[PDB]
Amino acid sequence: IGISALTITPDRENVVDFTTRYMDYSVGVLLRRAEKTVDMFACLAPFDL
């Protein structure tokens, strides 16, 4: 028996048999909470360098 975070894929399914999926896969993002702190030099933004 194999048991892990093993995603079902067609290629693996040519060499192993999979049971019914019990948990749905998804792609997502980890972020830090928004540090909306103004840029240290925001006062120079009005004109290009």
Next chain:
Amino acid sequence: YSSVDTKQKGGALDIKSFAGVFCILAAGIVLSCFIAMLETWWNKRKGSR
């Protein structure tokens, strides 16, 4: 699919978008040079300075 080539992101003014303002100083330079030319010419005919 291009609606417009945005290019800018910071919204800072750049030499192109500010270009019209320099034309006022250029015109002032040109006109003051021409006034200096006219005085330098008339200084050949005033007889006194």
